Design a protein around this ligand. Structure first.
Ligand code: MG
Ligand code: MG
Ligand code: MG
Ligand code: MG
Ligand code: MG
Ligand code: MG
Ligand code: MG
Ligand code: MG
Lengths: 481, 481, 481, 481
């Protein structure tokens, strides 16, 4: 069965046909389109900036999530969780990105931009409407209550999204434990959902920063990372009309190993070209960025000793120099060193919060959101477009019905059953962007904060670099009538 | 010249023709429409709640603003500002609602939802593009920097919007003062724009809470407050299908005097009916609400002694009782006492922040935004609809131009000149909702947080009370193509 | 019966005999002594600074407290408290300064530096040991829990110290109310001790800043304020060896009226001298000081228009000028304008927190604490010195008793009965400085933060101005043996 | 040369002679005395509680500090500091405990309780009076400014006290670096004193928690830890009259290894007794205490799996059980589980802040401070008692001199030279408790917050357990005269 990284690999395998009409032809197929929420005149962009993980380096699915899952389960068992966790196995059909974990009640929630509950799952049991009112009287959560609610926003969170559901299901059904509203009881030991969640969160961090996940990734890069020969071509085209920079949270050693792989072709920008080191594609390279803090105060600007991969002692005070690698600093480092203002910058990333929302809101940067799942989402949205149309029709009929003073009822049931049918085509937690006719929190933040978005940053290759990406003018309801 | 309260008074004078087809006929004229951002099934609404000032009690314009202006200037002169302030006179053509005062540089700003500068005015001098980059390098402000930026969000802020521009203009041009980036210098006295702004803000508060403004309003209610005979009819219709409540920041004595006027007709809900006291229209009356805090922790629930208008000593712990008047409490007081959940409640108000955003985001209430200016805005938007169309056309042409590698230039100038022409038809600070093709912060918050909105809450009279207000389903760009 | 302001008036009436040996003779009588906690070489002091209220202007007792009490009770009755409050009457024998009001349980507490309970009074009923453990299991309070505990530190707090005890007693014994652990219940109205306390606190503030207290004080200054002809003499002697400044929280108009009275004699510094305006005694005059904030960030430095008593608009940026009066600013204003460092400054005040602790800890100023009660305290401490000696003896015997494995018991009772006997000689809440052999919080803060202290600042007149006030070197226990 | 752990080992070697008159004889020699700041009736103590590191487990000096120093220097060199650091070598004559590191200017400071500078050392250069005013205009620091000032309060801080001085000296004198007010410059790399200090701090933590320090300690316990056969005797005597508990920040595995060593004798409480496991001496054992947080909210109470040394999953909710080992929790865990109030508890520790100040102030616990250096301090204070007397005499003479209007000058120089002579007998940073006649911050906090204190907790063995430790009643200056 074809995953979303599979469709990315297919396109990644194909060479760049830069014939002008092949590009137009290519960029009307929606897989290869750049989609536009707010209008952007590429001619005015002076700096193209990049995230790395799941932006330049898309990890293959479900291999990477499975590996992260396996390593996280073993960290938990190693710290004392029960051995039965080792029989868990990652199932990519369950988790959708952007879910909310309620650490009070142990539910995964899919919500809209206002915190309305679209899906509620306790372990693997999907709680429906009336049952959810017992815990959510108004069917609503205050998502800015970040002490209770954790939003699982990155593809790095997909393993723990599934794992948390596994854990709830396990403790709920294992007779050694007694279920309570707020966690599980085994004699004089009480395990709250909240402390369960913290352990999972800690295990994921540890696996990434003290465990073996990076090691296992780098020793089988072909198994775990998508490679695309068109990347050096896109970056060198960008270098011709402007400056290119890298700003990543990862450290230098991991960044160097991953980026060496991403440029490991028998050629440079195009076949026949001398191969060039990955660093030569960037006017500025910054690691340990600590985004989103990076877009505020940031941290002290350091200089990487690239021979040892350690930071040099002290704050770096000097000029932008060929060959230098920076660590920490802030968004103002980029602006100062490349002589750019926020709106001269297109920053390309995959973290809707850490890359897009914060650079937009706090600095006025232009934004490009990479959504790796979009390839699969697009395939499903077109296949089952019929169901969405029926959903629209049923809503219009439901209105032209209330306006005539138990028919309104069978429609509401028909609406709920089409919604479910549509949602199941994406997975058990439904599409990334909606549940039926109701848009997700994630969808609404994409529209709000990503000026452009696409299945992959590479789709920029298919647009001339003076292109004006145009969204339609937005009208308030009273401006139409 | 016809102000926005003038169009509200015209409709306010007309009797309710409750013939079913006259209502349909009436509610297709846009002045009398309820506009829909998100869909709402009125059948499911159990409680209708109300703000008072500029919701139930719309103050006549420009009389009320002029009075507030005059009293505020006299408070300033009385505390030491120069006597020339007394020659100021309120000019309603200057201020638009929702402007941002930059206390650092002394500018009034009209911004979009992202903080991009649409208009910059220093005193009465409109700073244009390149000049604004000197202070706004990226043409952008971080509007959540509430220590520097004050958003003038209510019609109560219209006098001080004009006054601040008056003050900057005066000090800038009076030779006793020397202009600096950050304020004005008169020998060894330095007056920052920030301290100037605080004085204005303080003077407005004082005028409202220790000055004579309330006194002068209540002694000529006919001069200062719109009255509508259809209000008791709307409220009694609401009482038939649900509960009605009042939740206002004003105190009991001012509330009683204003509401007595709003119901002061020789009849009750309709002509021929016995007149009823205003309190009998409400299942729950709450004053000193302290919104938006009201929608969080709130404050301690007190009980008003309605004979004296003072609070009884102690926290009120009892049941909802006929005749009782509440003070403070929280949104949960309403929910508890009327046995409602957030989505059973339609709260009707005019404070985009204090009434709508906070009740929506923090409690999941349904929202109705009253926008008194909308009558005038609608008259202008239709009159000069030609200019907006040309604006759309020029943007489409500007794109089909960049896509062909100094023509792009004269168009950009034509875009800037139509934008200006369009904006001047609303006033010197343009429409409440846009500058040309760019929507304002205010417009974007209306769309985001007001489920319904209208020139007046009374437009609900023209819709049957099982009506399903329907917005179109929203699609992301990739969902269309 | 002779109050503490009475002994201050007696000394205030006597002329300055500046014969060198009369001064030595005078300053060995303890009423007129300056007492020394840490050593201070007056020769090194460059600036003498002053508080006004209860430092330069000592209010007569019990007239002033009675007036503040009467006006505070009437504010409460006027806001809705019951009429029986008007029969309350200030009783100076009850309150001691420095008591702690527990807003949770409605008790007045006398504590030591560690929060140990020395006295607990609910209304007028003194709770003893075992009964107090019901609410204070460890007989201890965390006095830095300023949300629950209010320390009544100034002589301005003496009326509300008594009033709070009156209120608790009244509600406790009035049959309309039902006592609970945390307040009082009258049907559906619950009045917590905490909300009771806030009303009292608010009523005191209001009386001082919006009521008639200042008016009534200034129209009978002879009834309410101690006057001393030796004050202009002390200040002019200080001006000869250094700079003098005034830094008070009171506003200019009240300060001017009070200081005019304090210098209203038919002469200047000494009899025969031309009278001089009070301002001529000060190198720097600062009102609206907002201490203790004054000793941190402070506030913006303003300049008083002394003709109108209003502040000039703007921040004052100029030099120290003859005749100028300052408002707000910070401790650094003094240091800058008088060219002094913290340890060149002796600041003389009566607020153990607002004047002494904060200037010492945050700025390293030298400190002089005025304790008006000390005259009365000294009279009592010497009269009943016998009881304290017996207290010492009983403790030594109690030790040489435990060290020999129900005798230890009758001693503990004898210790408790002498303690009570001693305490009652000062008033119902005992001495300011101790309960028996246990020092109060207040006493311990005097020793810790007041370099010098005295019944009145005027005692400095009796010491030559190169005098080295010497405390004994302090030794830790292991340094003696 | 005899260090302070040397004198502790001598006493540690001697067997307990429990003859009643040998105990009296022993506890009058000051090495073996318990010193008394506030009176304490041991008869009333119900729970004896213990810290471990530098309380029960005193590390030998200078071996332990040298090892910590060596491992910390290697961590720094390993992270990039220059190789010359490896030639550093710990010098125990330099650092005194309780010094303040000013991260702004790179000075070590010895201060008094008010922040007055007693000693200022930049690297190894002792800055004197007038030179210090350049950076400390008022010769004073605000020690509660914990962002700038770090107080080196534990014997664990002795290596980094010396190291920081080494680092400043090195960078100051190495010609590769250019000295600035705030740090050091090497081309485009600027190393602030603050970032230098953070690295040192981080290196010490890392060495303790991820490095080899614990490993190296546990493999040569005889080299690094004082052992005393009288410890099991003291604890079992305590168990007879009350409950004993352990509350330590260290984890279970390190605690078990250290405590096994402390009880590793061929006998139990006394020679001839069966050996008992260290756990059997405690009614409650708590590790991972996280003091001082422990004395506030604390953390979640966990249960240690003593077989694996890992925590069991979940919060422990059960009763106090024989054999159970607790982790985290709060001071209230002790109180609940042992049924004690704060003043029934004597907690014995060496952290003046983390053990004594916080338990006293926040919980009202009785306190015993272990000061390992006191043995050496006592030896020096008695040897050079002559110099302190001369210091007293010179102060009295300096006063009887000012009181007679350049003699006052040669005395001030004589005072400064005796002070220096006295201080050098303790080390280059002087006594822990004073510089000449001025007490240190540390000394003043001992007097304020340690009810009892001693060179070792074992001195309690020499007092019968109904003993009343008596301090003299404290008198304010006016209470003497
Ligand atoms: Mg990423
Ligand atoms: Mg819903
Ligand atoms: Mg309103
Ligand atoms: Mg723009
Ligand atoms: Mg005072
Ligand atoms: Mg006690
Ligand atoms: Mg310790
Ligand atoms: Mg000094």
């Amino acid at each position: 069965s074809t995953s979303w990284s599979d469709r990315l690999q297919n396109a990644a395998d194909m060479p760049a046909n830069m014939d002008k009409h092949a590009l137009k032809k290519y960029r009307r197929e929606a897989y290869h389109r750049v989609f536009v929420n707010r209008s952007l005149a590429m001619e005015k962009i002076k700096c193209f900036g990049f995230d790395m993980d799941y932006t330049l380096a898309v990890y293959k699915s479900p291999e990477y999530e499975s590996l992260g899952f396996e390593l996280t389960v073993e960290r938990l068992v190693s710290i004392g969780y029960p051995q039965e966790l080792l029989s868990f196995a990652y199932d990519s059909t369950f988790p959708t990105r952007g879910l909310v974990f309620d650490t009070l009640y142990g539910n995964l929630l899919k919500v809209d931009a206002y915190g309305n509950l679209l899906v509620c799952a306790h372990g693997f049991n999907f709680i429906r409407g009336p049952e959810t009112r017992e815990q959510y009287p108004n069917k609503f959560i205050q998502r800015d209550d970040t002490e209770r609610f954790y939003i699982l926003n990155t593809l790095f969170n997909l393993p723990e999204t599934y794992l948390l559901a596994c854990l709830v299901d396990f403790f709920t059904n294992c007779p050694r434990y007694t279920s309570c509203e707020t966690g599980f009881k085994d004699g004089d030991l009480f395990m709250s959902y909240r402390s369960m969640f913290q352990d999972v969160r800690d295990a994921v961090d540890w696996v990434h920063y003290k465990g073996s996940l990076k090691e296992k990734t780098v020793e089988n890069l072909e198994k775990y990372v998508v490679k695309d020969g068109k990347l050096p071509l896109l970056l060198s085209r960008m270098k011709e009309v402007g400056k290119v920079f890298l700003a990543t949270n990862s450290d230098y050693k991991y960044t160097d190993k991953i980026m060496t792989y991403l440029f490991d072709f028998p050629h440079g920008p195009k076949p026949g070209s001398s191969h060039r080191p990955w660093q030569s594609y960037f006017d500025l390279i910054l690691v340990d960025a600590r985004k989103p803090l990076f877009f505020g105060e940031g941290t002290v600007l350091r200089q990487v000793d690239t021979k040892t991969g350690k930071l040099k002692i002290g704050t770096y005070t000097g000029p932008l120099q060929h060959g230098i690698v920076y660590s920490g600093g802030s968004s103002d480092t980029i602006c100062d060193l490349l002589g750019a203002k926020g709106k001269d910058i297109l920053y390309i990333g995959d973290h809707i919060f850490g890359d897009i929302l914060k650079s937009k809101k706090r600095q006025g940067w232009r934004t490009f959101l990479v959504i790796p799942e979009l390839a699969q989402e697009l395939h499903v949205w077109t296949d089952k477009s019929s169901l969405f149309e029926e959903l629209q029709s049923l809503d219009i009929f439901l209105a032209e019905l209330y306006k005539h003073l138990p028919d309104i009822s069978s429609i509401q049931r028909r609406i709920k059953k089409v919604t479910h049918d549509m949602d199941m085509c994406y997975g058990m937690m439904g599409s990334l962007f909606r549940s039926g006719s109701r848009q997700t929190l994630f969808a609404s933040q994409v529209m709000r904060y990503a000026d452009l978005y696409a299945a992959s940053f590479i789709n920029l290759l298919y647009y001339p670099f003076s292109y004006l990406f145009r969204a339609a003018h937005v009208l308030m309801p009273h401006e139409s009538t």
